[PDB]
Amino acid sequence: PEEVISKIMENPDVAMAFQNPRVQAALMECSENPMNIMKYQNDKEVMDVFNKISQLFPGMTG
């Protein structure tokens, strides 16, 4: 996934957050389906990240 990881370097905030377990778990779990966020909803950390990812990537370029 070096392709997408390269674009994350755009916001050092997500690249730094990418170094968090709840985030890597949110993305690894995202594989199941966007319904995974309904689980990290309590993880305020994943919220700021998943809310940033969608606020800046709403149409999802990838």
CHARMM-style PDB file with segment names, atoms N, HN, CA, C and O in Angstrom:
ATOM      1  N   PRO     1       0.861  -1.213   0.000  1.00  0.00      PROA
ATOM      2  CA  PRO     1       0.000   0.000   0.000  1.00  0.00      PROA
ATOM      3  C   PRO     1       0.889   1.252   0.000  1.00  0.00      PROA
ATOM      4  O   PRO     1       0.469   2.306   0.477  1.00  0.00      PROA
ATOM      5  N   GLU     2       2.080   1.144  -0.517  1.00  0.00      PROA
ATOM      6  HN  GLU     2       2.422   0.287  -0.904  1.00  0.00      PROA
ATOM      7  CA  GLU     2       2.985   2.328  -0.549  1.00  0.00      PROA
ATOM      8  C   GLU     2       2.315   3.453  -1.342  1.00  0.00      PROA
ATOM      9  O   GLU     2       2.615   4.627  -1.124  1.00  0.00      PROA
ATOM     10  N   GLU     3       1.432   3.109  -2.239  1.00  0.00      PROA
ATOM     11  HN  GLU     3       1.189   2.155  -2.417  1.00  0.00      PROA
ATOM     12  CA  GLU     3       0.749   4.151  -3.058  1.00  0.00      PROA
ATOM     13  C   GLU     3      -0.055   5.095  -2.158  1.00  0.00      PROA
ATOM     14  O   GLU     3       0.193   6.301  -2.161  1.00  0.00      PROA
ATOM     15  N   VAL     4      -0.992   4.579  -1.407  1.00  0.00      PROA
ATOM     16  HN  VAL     4      -1.194   3.599  -1.405  1.00  0.00      PROA
ATOM     17  CA  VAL     4      -1.810   5.466  -0.529  1.00  0.00      PROA
ATOM     18  C   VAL     4      -0.943   6.027   0.602  1.00  0.00      PROA
ATOM     19  O   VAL     4      -1.005   7.226   0.877  1.00  0.00      PROA
ATOM     20  N   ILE     5      -0.157   5.208   1.248  1.00  0.00      PROA
ATOM     21  HN  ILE     5      -0.107   4.235   1.024  1.00  0.00      PROA
ATOM     22  CA  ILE     5       0.698   5.719   2.361  1.00  0.00      PROA
ATOM     23  C   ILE     5       1.496   6.937   1.887  1.00  0.00      PROA
ATOM     24  O   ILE     5       1.855   7.791   2.697  1.00  0.00      PROA
ATOM     25  N   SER     6       1.769   7.022   0.618  1.00  0.00      PROA
ATOM     26  HN  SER     6       1.478   6.328  -0.040  1.00  0.00      PROA
ATOM     27  CA  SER     6       2.540   8.186   0.103  1.00  0.00      PROA
ATOM     28  C   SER     6       1.689   9.453   0.208  1.00  0.00      PROA
ATOM     29  O   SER     6       2.213  10.525   0.511  1.00  0.00      PROA
ATOM     30  N   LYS     7       0.409   9.342  -0.034  1.00  0.00      PROA
ATOM     31  HN  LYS     7      -0.017   8.472  -0.280  1.00  0.00      PROA
ATOM     32  CA  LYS     7      -0.475  10.547   0.034  1.00  0.00      PROA
ATOM     33  C   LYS     7      -0.699  10.968   1.495  1.00  0.00      PROA
ATOM     34  O   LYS     7      -0.891  12.153   1.766  1.00  0.00      PROA
ATOM     35  N   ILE     8      -0.678  10.038   2.413  1.00  0.00      PROA
ATOM     36  HN  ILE     8      -0.523   9.076   2.192  1.00  0.00      PROA
ATOM     37  CA  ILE     8      -0.900  10.403   3.846  1.00  0.00      PROA
ATOM     38  C   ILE     8       0.180  11.397   4.285  1.00  0.00      PROA
ATOM     39  O   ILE     8      -0.064  12.228   5.159  1.00  0.00      PROA
ATOM     40  N   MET     9       1.341  11.318   3.699  1.00  0.00      PROA
ATOM     41  HN  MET     9       1.540  10.642   2.988  1.00  0.00      PROA
ATOM     42  CA  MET     9       2.442  12.248   4.082  1.00  0.00      PROA
ATOM     43  C   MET     9       2.002  13.694   3.848  1.00  0.00      PROA
ATOM     44  O   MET     9       2.718  14.624   4.221  1.00  0.00      PROA
ATOM     45  N   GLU    10       0.861  13.889   3.247  1.00  0.00      PROA
ATOM     46  HN  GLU    10       0.280  13.134   2.944  1.00  0.00      PROA
ATOM     47  CA  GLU    10       0.383  15.275   2.987  1.00  0.00      PROA
ATOM     48  C   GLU    10       0.008  15.943   4.312  1.00  0.00      PROA
ATOM     49  O   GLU    10       0.272  17.129   4.508  1.00  0.00      PROA
ATOM     50  N   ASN    11      -0.596  15.195   5.201  1.00  0.00      PROA
ATOM     51  HN  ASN    11      -0.811  14.232   5.042  1.00  0.00      PROA
ATOM     52  CA  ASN    11      -1.013  15.747   6.527  1.00  0.00      PROA
ATOM     53  C   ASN    11      -0.236  15.026   7.637  1.00  0.00      PROA
ATOM     54  O   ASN    11      -0.706  14.007   8.143  1.00  0.00      PROA
ATOM     55  N   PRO    12       0.921  15.523   8.019  1.00  0.00      PROA
ATOM     56  CA  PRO    12       1.739  14.887   9.093  1.00  0.00      PROA
ATOM     57  C   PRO    12       0.876  14.497  10.300  1.00  0.00      PROA
ATOM     58  O   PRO    12       1.308  13.720  11.152  1.00  0.00      PROA
ATOM     59  N   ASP    13      -0.314  15.026  10.365  1.00  0.00      PROA
ATOM     60  HN  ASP    13      -0.665  15.657   9.674  1.00  0.00      PROA
ATOM     61  CA  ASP    13      -1.230  14.701  11.492  1.00  0.00      PROA
ATOM     62  C   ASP    13      -1.736  13.266  11.336  1.00  0.00      PROA
ATOM     63  O   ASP    13      -1.776  12.514  12.310  1.00  0.00      PROA
ATOM     64  N   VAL    14      -2.115  12.891  10.142  1.00  0.00      PROA
ATOM     65  HN  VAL    14      -2.082  13.501   9.351  1.00  0.00      PROA
ATOM     66  CA  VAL    14      -2.615  11.505   9.914  1.00  0.00      PROA
ATOM     67  C   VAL    14      -1.425  10.557   9.866  1.00  0.00      PROA
ATOM     68  O   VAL    14      -1.500   9.439  10.376  1.00  0.00      PROA
ATOM     69  N   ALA    15      -0.353  10.987   9.272  1.00  0.00      PROA
ATOM     70  HN  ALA    15      -0.292  11.895   8.858  1.00  0.00      PROA
ATOM     71  CA  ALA    15       0.853  10.126   9.202  1.00  0.00      PROA
ATOM     72  C   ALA    15       1.322   9.823  10.625  1.00  0.00      PROA
ATOM     73  O   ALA    15       1.784   8.718  10.907  1.00  0.00      PROA
ATOM     74  N   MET    16       1.206  10.783  11.501  1.00  0.00      PROA
ATOM     75  HN  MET    16       0.830  11.681  11.272  1.00  0.00      PROA
ATOM     76  CA  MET    16       1.619  10.568  12.912  1.00  0.00      PROA
ATOM     77  C   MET    16       0.554   9.722  13.594  1.00  0.00      PROA
ATOM     78  O   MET    16       0.867   8.870  14.425  1.00  0.00      PROA
ATOM     79  N   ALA    17      -0.680   9.954  13.247  1.00  0.00      PROA
ATOM     80  HN  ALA    17      -0.935  10.646  12.572  1.00  0.00      PROA
ATOM     81  CA  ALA    17      -1.786   9.166  13.851  1.00  0.00      PROA
ATOM     82  C   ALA    17      -1.689   7.741  13.323  1.00  0.00      PROA
ATOM     83  O   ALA    17      -2.023   6.789  14.028  1.00  0.00      PROA
ATOM     84  N   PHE    18      -1.240   7.598  12.108  1.00  0.00      PROA
ATOM     85  HN  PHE    18      -0.968   8.371  11.535  1.00  0.00      PROA
ATOM     86  CA  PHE    18      -1.092   6.237  11.519  1.00  0.00      PROA
ATOM     87  C   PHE    18      -0.209   5.400  12.455  1.00  0.00      PROA
ATOM     88  O   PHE    18      -0.246   4.171  12.407  1.00  0.00      PROA
ATOM     89  N   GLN    19       0.567   6.050  13.286  1.00  0.00      PROA
ATOM     90  HN  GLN    19       0.598   7.049  13.325  1.00  0.00      PROA
ATOM     91  CA  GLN    19       1.456   5.309  14.230  1.00  0.00      PROA
ATOM     92  C   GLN    19       0.697   5.014  15.525  1.00  0.00      PROA
ATOM     93  O   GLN    19       1.314   4.847  16.577  1.00  0.00      PROA
ATOM     94  N   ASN    20      -0.614   4.949  15.460  1.00  0.00      PROA
ATOM     95  HN  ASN    20      -1.116   5.084  14.606  1.00  0.00      PROA
ATOM     96  CA  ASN    20      -1.434   4.653  16.677  1.00  0.00      PROA
ATOM     97  C   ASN    20      -2.093   3.282  16.485  1.00  0.00      PROA
ATOM     98  O   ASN    20      -2.440   2.930  15.358  1.00  0.00      PROA
ATOM     99  N   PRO    21      -2.269   2.516  17.535  1.00  0.00      PROA
ATOM    100  CA  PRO    21      -2.888   1.164  17.422  1.00  0.00      PROA
ATOM    101  C   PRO    21      -4.385   1.238  17.085  1.00  0.00      PROA
ATOM    102  O   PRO    21      -4.857   0.508  16.214  1.00  0.00      PROA
ATOM    103  N   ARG    22      -5.112   2.091  17.752  1.00  0.00      PROA
ATOM    104  HN  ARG    22      -4.729   2.684  18.460  1.00  0.00      PROA
ATOM    105  CA  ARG    22      -6.571   2.204  17.469  1.00  0.00      PROA
ATOM    106  C   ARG    22      -6.774   2.618  16.009  1.00  0.00      PROA
ATOM    107  O   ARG    22      -7.756   2.219  15.383  1.00  0.00      PROA
ATOM    108  N   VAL    23      -5.872   3.396  15.477  1.00  0.00      PROA
ATOM    109  HN  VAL    23      -5.074   3.720  15.985  1.00  0.00      PROA
ATOM    110  CA  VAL    23      -6.002   3.836  14.057  1.00  0.00      PROA
ATOM    111  C   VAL    23      -5.660   2.665  13.139  1.00  0.00      PROA
ATOM    112  O   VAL    23      -6.446   2.329  12.253  1.00  0.00      PROA
ATOM    113  N   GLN    24      -4.521   2.053  13.333  1.00  0.00      PROA
ATOM    114  HN  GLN    24      -3.883   2.327  14.053  1.00  0.00      PROA
ATOM    115  CA  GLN    24      -4.149   0.893  12.476  1.00  0.00      PROA
ATOM    116  C   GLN    24      -5.244  -0.165  12.600  1.00  0.00      PROA
ATOM    117  O   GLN    24      -5.548  -0.863  11.633  1.00  0.00      PROA
ATOM    118  N   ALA    25      -5.822  -0.280  13.764  1.00  0.00      PROA
ATOM    119  HN  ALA    25      -5.575   0.287  14.550  1.00  0.00      PROA
ATOM    120  CA  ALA    25      -6.912  -1.272  13.967  1.00  0.00      PROA
ATOM    121  C   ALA    25      -8.166  -0.776  13.256  1.00  0.00      PROA
ATOM    122  O   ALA    25      -8.938  -1.578  12.729  1.00  0.00      PROA
ATOM    123  N   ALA    26      -8.371   0.511  13.236  1.00  0.00      PROA
ATOM    124  HN  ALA    26      -7.744   1.162  13.663  1.00  0.00      PROA
ATOM    125  CA  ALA    26      -9.568   1.061  12.547  1.00  0.00      PROA
ATOM    126  C   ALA    26      -9.414   0.840  11.041  1.00  0.00      PROA
ATOM    127  O   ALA    26     -10.376   0.469  10.368  1.00  0.00      PROA
ATOM    128  N   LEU    27      -8.235   1.061  10.521  1.00  0.00      PROA
ATOM    129  HN  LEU    27      -7.454   1.363  11.067  1.00  0.00      PROA
ATOM    130  CA  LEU    27      -8.006   0.857   9.061  1.00  0.00      PROA
ATOM    131  C   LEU    27      -8.011  -0.639   8.758  1.00  0.00      PROA
ATOM    132  O   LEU    27      -8.676  -1.073   7.817  1.00  0.00      PROA
ATOM    133  N   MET    28      -7.295  -1.416   9.523  1.00  0.00      PROA
ATOM    134  HN  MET    28      -6.755  -1.063  10.287  1.00  0.00      PROA
ATOM    135  CA  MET    28      -7.279  -2.884   9.274  1.00  0.00      PROA
ATOM    136  C   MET    28      -8.711  -3.400   9.393  1.00  0.00      PROA
ATOM    137  O   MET    28      -9.129  -4.247   8.604  1.00  0.00      PROA
ATOM    138  N   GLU    29      -9.450  -2.910  10.350  1.00  0.00      PROA
ATOM    139  HN  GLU    29      -9.111  -2.222  10.992  1.00  0.00      PROA
ATOM    140  CA  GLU    29     -10.858  -3.363  10.495  1.00  0.00      PROA
ATOM    141  C   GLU    29     -11.692  -2.729   9.381  1.00  0.00      PROA
ATOM    142  O   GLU    29     -12.670  -3.328   8.933  1.00  0.00      PROA
ATOM    143  N   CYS    30     -11.327  -1.547   8.935  1.00  0.00      PROA
ATOM    144  HN  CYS    30     -10.533  -1.061   9.299  1.00  0.00      PROA
ATOM    145  CA  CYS    30     -12.112  -0.897   7.838  1.00  0.00      PROA
ATOM    146  C   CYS    30     -12.264  -1.896   6.690  1.00  0.00      PROA
ATOM    147  O   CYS    30     -13.216  -1.812   5.914  1.00  0.00      PROA
ATOM    148  N   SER    31     -11.346  -2.820   6.585  1.00  0.00      PROA
ATOM    149  HN  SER    31     -10.572  -2.888   7.215  1.00  0.00      PROA
ATOM    150  CA  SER    31     -11.425  -3.838   5.511  1.00  0.00      PROA
ATOM    151  C   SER    31     -12.787  -4.527   5.574  1.00  0.00      PROA
ATOM    152  O   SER    31     -13.382  -4.815   4.535  1.00  0.00      PROA
ATOM    153  N   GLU    32     -13.276  -4.789   6.760  1.00  0.00      PROA
ATOM    154  HN  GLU    32     -12.793  -4.555   7.604  1.00  0.00      PROA
ATOM    155  CA  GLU    32     -14.609  -5.451   6.879  1.00  0.00      PROA
ATOM    156  C   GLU    32     -15.648  -4.592   6.162  1.00  0.00      PROA
ATOM    157  O   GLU    32     -16.331  -5.071   5.257  1.00  0.00      PROA
ATOM    158  N   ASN    33     -15.767  -3.349   6.553  1.00  0.00      PROA
ATOM    159  HN  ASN    33     -15.212  -2.960   7.288  1.00  0.00      PROA
ATOM    160  CA  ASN    33     -16.749  -2.438   5.889  1.00  0.00      PROA
ATOM    161  C   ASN    33     -16.840  -1.126   6.693  1.00  0.00      PROA
ATOM    162  O   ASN    33     -16.620  -1.142   7.904  1.00  0.00      PROA
ATOM    163  N   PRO    34     -17.152  -0.017   6.058  1.00  0.00      PROA
ATOM    164  CA  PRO    34     -17.289   1.295   6.762  1.00  0.00      PROA
ATOM    165  C   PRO    34     -18.111   1.186   8.058  1.00  0.00      PROA
ATOM    166  O   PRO    34     -18.186   2.150   8.819  1.00  0.00      PROA
ATOM    167  N   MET    35     -18.712   0.051   8.307  1.00  0.00      PROA
ATOM    168  HN  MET    35     -18.651  -0.732   7.689  1.00  0.00      PROA
ATOM    169  CA  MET    35     -19.545  -0.106   9.538  1.00  0.00      PROA
ATOM    170  C   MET    35     -18.646  -0.289  10.758  1.00  0.00      PROA
ATOM    171  O   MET    35     -19.135  -0.294  11.888  1.00  0.00      PROA
ATOM    172  N   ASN    36     -17.370  -0.435  10.549  1.00  0.00      PROA
ATOM    173  HN  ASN    36     -16.973  -0.431   9.632  1.00  0.00      PROA
ATOM    174  CA  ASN    36     -16.445  -0.632  11.698  1.00  0.00      PROA
ATOM    175  C   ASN    36     -16.358   0.645  12.534  1.00  0.00      PROA
ATOM    176  O   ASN    36     -16.209   0.572  13.753  1.00  0.00      PROA
ATOM    177  N   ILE    37     -16.446   1.787  11.910  1.00  0.00      PROA
ATOM    178  HN  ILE    37     -16.567   1.847  10.919  1.00  0.00      PROA
ATOM    179  CA  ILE    37     -16.356   3.060  12.681  1.00  0.00      PROA
ATOM    180  C   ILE    37     -17.429   3.068  13.774  1.00  0.00      PROA
ATOM    181  O   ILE    37     -17.222   3.644  14.842  1.00  0.00      PROA
ATOM    182  N   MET    38     -18.545   2.447  13.516  1.00  0.00      PROA
ATOM    183  HN  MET    38     -18.714   1.979  12.649  1.00  0.00      PROA
ATOM    184  CA  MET    38     -19.630   2.409  14.532  1.00  0.00      PROA
ATOM    185  C   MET    38     -19.105   1.738  15.803  1.00  0.00      PROA
ATOM    186  O   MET    38     -19.780   1.750  16.832  1.00  0.00      PROA
ATOM    187  N   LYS    39     -17.929   1.165  15.738  1.00  0.00      PROA
ATOM    188  HN  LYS    39     -17.381   1.156  14.902  1.00  0.00      PROA
ATOM    189  CA  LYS    39     -17.338   0.490  16.936  1.00  0.00      PROA
ATOM    190  C   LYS    39     -16.329   1.431  17.598  1.00  0.00      PROA
ATOM    191  O   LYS    39     -16.337   1.580  18.820  1.00  0.00      PROA
ATOM    192  N   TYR    40     -15.479   2.052  16.822  1.00  0.00      PROA
ATOM    193  HN  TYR    40     -15.473   1.931  15.830  1.00  0.00      PROA
ATOM    194  CA  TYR    40     -14.475   2.980  17.404  1.00  0.00      PROA
ATOM    195  C   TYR    40     -15.152   4.306  17.748  1.00  0.00      PROA
ATOM    196  O   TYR    40     -14.482   5.254  18.159  1.00  0.00      PROA
ATOM    197  N   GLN    41     -16.446   4.380  17.588  1.00  0.00      PROA
ATOM    198  HN  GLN    41     -16.990   3.611  17.254  1.00  0.00      PROA
ATOM    199  CA  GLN    41     -17.169   5.645  17.907  1.00  0.00      PROA
ATOM    200  C   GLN    41     -16.808   6.093  19.325  1.00  0.00      PROA
ATOM    201  O   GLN    41     -16.829   7.287  19.621  1.00  0.00      PROA
ATOM    202  N   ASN    42     -16.483   5.162  20.183  1.00  0.00      PROA
ATOM    203  HN  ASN    42     -16.466   4.191  19.943  1.00  0.00      PROA
ATOM    204  CA  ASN    42     -16.108   5.525  21.579  1.00  0.00      PROA
ATOM    205  C   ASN    42     -14.639   5.943  21.596  1.00  0.00      PROA
ATOM    206  O   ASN    42     -14.223   6.706  22.468  1.00  0.00      PROA
ATOM    207  N   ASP    43     -13.867   5.457  20.658  1.00  0.00      PROA
ATOM    208  HN  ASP    43     -14.205   4.838  19.950  1.00  0.00      PROA
ATOM    209  CA  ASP    43     -12.422   5.825  20.611  1.00  0.00      PROA
ATOM    210  C   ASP    43     -12.286   7.233  20.015  1.00  0.00      PROA
ATOM    211  O   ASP    43     -12.082   7.379  18.810  1.00  0.00      PROA
ATOM    212  N   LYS    44     -12.396   8.243  20.839  1.00  0.00      PROA
ATOM    213  HN  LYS    44     -12.562   8.124  21.818  1.00  0.00      PROA
ATOM    214  CA  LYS    44     -12.305   9.643  20.342  1.00  0.00      PROA
ATOM    215  C   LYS    44     -11.069   9.822  19.454  1.00  0.00      PROA
ATOM    216  O   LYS    44     -11.076  10.668  18.560  1.00  0.00      PROA
ATOM    217  N   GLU    45     -10.036   9.061  19.681  1.00  0.00      PROA
ATOM    218  HN  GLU    45     -10.030   8.374  20.408  1.00  0.00      PROA
ATOM    219  CA  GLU    45      -8.817   9.206  18.837  1.00  0.00      PROA
ATOM    220  C   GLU    45      -9.160   8.807  17.397  1.00  0.00      PROA
ATOM    221  O   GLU    45      -8.906   9.573  16.467  1.00  0.00      PROA
ATOM    222  N   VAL    46      -9.721   7.645  17.214  1.00  0.00      PROA
ATOM    223  HN  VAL    46      -9.928   7.023  17.970  1.00  0.00      PROA
ATOM    224  CA  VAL    46     -10.081   7.199  15.841  1.00  0.00      PROA
ATOM    225  C   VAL    46     -11.093   8.168  15.242  1.00  0.00      PROA
ATOM    226  O   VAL    46     -11.120   8.353  14.025  1.00  0.00      PROA
ATOM    227  N   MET    47     -11.907   8.774  16.054  1.00  0.00      PROA
ATOM    228  HN  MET    47     -11.885   8.624  17.042  1.00  0.00      PROA
ATOM    229  CA  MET    47     -12.926   9.718  15.515  1.00  0.00      PROA
ATOM    230  C   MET    47     -12.230  10.893  14.838  1.00  0.00      PROA
ATOM    231  O   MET    47     -12.536  11.207  13.687  1.00  0.00      PROA
ATOM    232  N   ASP    48     -11.325  11.531  15.513  1.00  0.00      PROA
ATOM    233  HN  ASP    48     -11.077  11.276  16.448  1.00  0.00      PROA
ATOM    234  CA  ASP    48     -10.618  12.689  14.899  1.00  0.00      PROA
ATOM    235  C   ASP    48      -9.934  12.255  13.604  1.00  0.00      PROA
ATOM    236  O   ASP    48      -9.861  13.026  12.647  1.00  0.00      PROA
ATOM    237  N   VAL    49      -9.447  11.053  13.577  1.00  0.00      PROA
ATOM    238  HN  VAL    49      -9.506  10.427  14.355  1.00  0.00      PROA
ATOM    239  CA  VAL    49      -8.725  10.555  12.380  1.00  0.00      PROA
ATOM    240  C   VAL    49      -9.706  10.162  11.279  1.00  0.00      PROA
ATOM    241  O   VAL    49      -9.599  10.646  10.152  1.00  0.00      PROA
ATOM    242  N   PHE    50     -10.634   9.314  11.588  1.00  0.00      PROA
ATOM    243  HN  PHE    50     -10.721   8.920  12.504  1.00  0.00      PROA
ATOM    244  CA  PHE    50     -11.618   8.872  10.567  1.00  0.00      PROA
ATOM    245  C   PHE    50     -12.487  10.063  10.155  1.00  0.00      PROA
ATOM    246  O   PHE    50     -13.009  10.089   9.041  1.00  0.00      PROA
ATOM    247  N   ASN    51     -12.643  11.022  11.022  1.00  0.00      PROA
ATOM    248  HN  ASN    51     -12.219  11.000  11.928  1.00  0.00      PROA
ATOM    249  CA  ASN    51     -13.460  12.217  10.671  1.00  0.00      PROA
ATOM    250  C   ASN    51     -12.607  13.143   9.815  1.00  0.00      PROA
ATOM    251  O   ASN    51     -13.140  13.914   9.017  1.00  0.00      PROA
ATOM    252  N   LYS    52     -11.311  13.077   9.971  1.00  0.00      PROA
ATOM    253  HN  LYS    52     -10.878  12.451  10.620  1.00  0.00      PROA
ATOM    254  CA  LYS    52     -10.421  13.941   9.149  1.00  0.00      PROA
ATOM    255  C   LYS    52     -10.288  13.289   7.781  1.00  0.00      PROA
ATOM    256  O   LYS    52     -10.434  13.943   6.748  1.00  0.00      PROA
ATOM    257  N   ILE    53     -10.014  12.023   7.791  1.00  0.00      PROA
ATOM    258  HN  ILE    53      -9.896  11.492   8.630  1.00  0.00      PROA
ATOM    259  CA  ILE    53      -9.863  11.251   6.534  1.00  0.00      PROA
ATOM    260  C   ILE    53     -11.084  11.496   5.634  1.00  0.00      PROA
ATOM    261  O   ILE    53     -10.932  11.726   4.434  1.00  0.00      PROA
ATOM    262  N   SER    54     -12.258  11.449   6.196  1.00  0.00      PROA
ATOM    263  HN  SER    54     -12.381  11.262   7.170  1.00  0.00      PROA
ATOM    264  CA  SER    54     -13.492  11.640   5.374  1.00  0.00      PROA
ATOM    265  C   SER    54     -13.739  13.125   5.094  1.00  0.00      PROA
ATOM    266  O   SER    54     -14.217  13.470   4.014  1.00  0.00      PROA
ATOM    267  N   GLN    55     -13.432  13.988   6.023  1.00  0.00      PROA
ATOM    268  HN  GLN    55     -13.043  13.708   6.901  1.00  0.00      PROA
ATOM    269  CA  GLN    55     -13.669  15.441   5.783  1.00  0.00      PROA
ATOM    270  C   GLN    55     -12.749  15.917   4.655  1.00  0.00      PROA
ATOM    271  O   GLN    55     -13.152  16.745   3.838  1.00  0.00      PROA
ATOM    272  N   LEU    56     -11.545  15.412   4.607  1.00  0.00      PROA
ATOM    273  HN  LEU    56     -11.218  14.739   5.271  1.00  0.00      PROA
ATOM    274  CA  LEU    56     -10.589  15.829   3.536  1.00  0.00      PROA
ATOM    275  C   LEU    56     -10.720  14.877   2.339  1.00  0.00      PROA
ATOM    276  O   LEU    56     -10.473  15.280   1.202  1.00  0.00      PROA
ATOM    277  N   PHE    57     -11.099  13.640   2.580  1.00  0.00      PROA
ATOM    278  HN  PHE    57     -11.299  13.313   3.504  1.00  0.00      PROA
ATOM    279  CA  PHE    57     -11.248  12.644   1.462  1.00  0.00      PROA
ATOM    280  C   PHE    57     -12.689  12.102   1.441  1.00  0.00      PROA
ATOM    281  O   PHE    57     -12.887  10.889   1.515  1.00  0.00      PROA
ATOM    282  N   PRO    58     -13.670  12.967   1.344  1.00  0.00      PROA
ATOM    283  CA  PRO    58     -15.103  12.542   1.308  1.00  0.00      PROA
ATOM    284  C   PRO    58     -15.398  11.660   0.087  1.00  0.00      PROA
ATOM    285  O   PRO    58     -16.045  10.621   0.218  1.00  0.00      PROA
ATOM    286  N   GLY    59     -14.939  12.060  -1.070  1.00  0.00      PROA
ATOM    287  HN  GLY    59     -14.414  12.904  -1.177  1.00  0.00      PROA
ATOM    288  CA  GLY    59     -15.183  11.247  -2.299  1.00  0.00      PROA
ATOM    289  C   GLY    59     -14.169  10.104  -2.359  1.00  0.00      PROA
ATOM    290  O   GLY    59     -14.264   9.239  -3.231  1.00  0.00      PROA
ATOM    291  N   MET    60     -13.220  10.093  -1.461  1.00  0.00      PROA
ATOM    292  HN  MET    60     -13.142  10.796  -0.753  1.00  0.00      PROA
ATOM    293  CA  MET    60     -12.193   9.009  -1.458  1.00  0.00      PROA
ATOM    294  C   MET    60     -11.545   8.905  -2.841  1.00  0.00      PROA
ATOM    295  O   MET    60     -12.106   8.277  -3.739  1.00  0.00      PROA
ATOM    296  N   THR    61     -10.397   9.501  -3.016  1.00  0.00      PROA
ATOM    297  HN  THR    61      -9.941  10.012  -2.287  1.00  0.00      PROA
ATOM    298  CA  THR    61      -9.716   9.435  -4.339  1.00  0.00      PROA
ATOM    299  C   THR    61      -9.359   7.982  -4.658  1.00  0.00      PROA
ATOM    300  O   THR    61      -9.668   7.496  -5.746  1.00  0.00      PROA
ATOM    301  N   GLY    62      -8.726   7.302  -3.741  1.00  0.00      PROA
ATOM    302  HN  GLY    62      -8.475   7.697  -2.857  1.00  0.00      PROA
ATOM    303  CA  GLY    62      -8.351   5.882  -3.992  1.00  0.00      PROA
ATOM    304  C   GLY    62      -9.609   5.065  -4.293  1.00  0.00      PROA
ATOM    305  OT1 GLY    62      -9.520   3.860  -4.531  1.00  0.00      PROA
TER     306      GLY     62
END
